[PDB]
Amino acid sequence: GFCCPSHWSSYDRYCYKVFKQEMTWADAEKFCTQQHTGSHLVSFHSTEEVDFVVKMTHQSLKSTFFWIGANNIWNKCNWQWSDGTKPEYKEWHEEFECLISRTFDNQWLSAPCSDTYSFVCKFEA
């Protein structure tokens, strides 16, 4: 395959890097896009791939939490009143949640998009 640049790590045919500076989701994502062509917050499509990136961040990070690349997880939903109707009128507490990984497990959770975490960038070699 192609090789990853210095200071990034390879797994399958992608390149990954931990960044320690803590940023909002949106900032982490944008910053990822400026480290390298093709680059974004990491996304995951296998257990094996979460384990790889969890090992990498555990070995390098002091916080235990890091952004991965999915935003607004509950804004995006099709919400519906149980009487079967769709809410024309709304008064939602405004909230934005974003996906987060942990460094001691494969499992994910969320945080407000506005909070501040270390993150992992990824792109196809």
């Binding site: 499509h45 979460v50 995006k76 008064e91 996906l99 494969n106 499992q107 959770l109 969320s110």
Partner: protein
Amino acid sequence: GLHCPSDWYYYDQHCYRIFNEEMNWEDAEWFCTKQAKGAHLVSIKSAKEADFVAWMVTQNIEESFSHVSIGLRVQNKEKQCSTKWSDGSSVSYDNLLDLYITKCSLLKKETGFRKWFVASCIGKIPFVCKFPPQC
């Protein structure tokens, strides 16, 4: 007691009532359904009806409860509702924890029962019922 049963309130054209009993969202919605034809967890369809419901809950909730289920729920079958990752690829694998799946909704005492908050469907809380009486 003219259009609603005892302990229900009449507002615009529906009867309402908070039950101070702790239940998860679907047990609550099923319980509502058993109270009357067409009943469900409340739905709140304008600022005036949000106003009326918040007052009613303020006046009848037991002092040691402070969250009330309402009838809005996510329909999507996936764990959370982003179908894409920011690199454009699709969310086809997903390891989000049950604890962080918040597909139901609720009102809070600490905000005058006025905005709507996402919540876990497995929490056990009081809830409001709504139905349209017949004439």
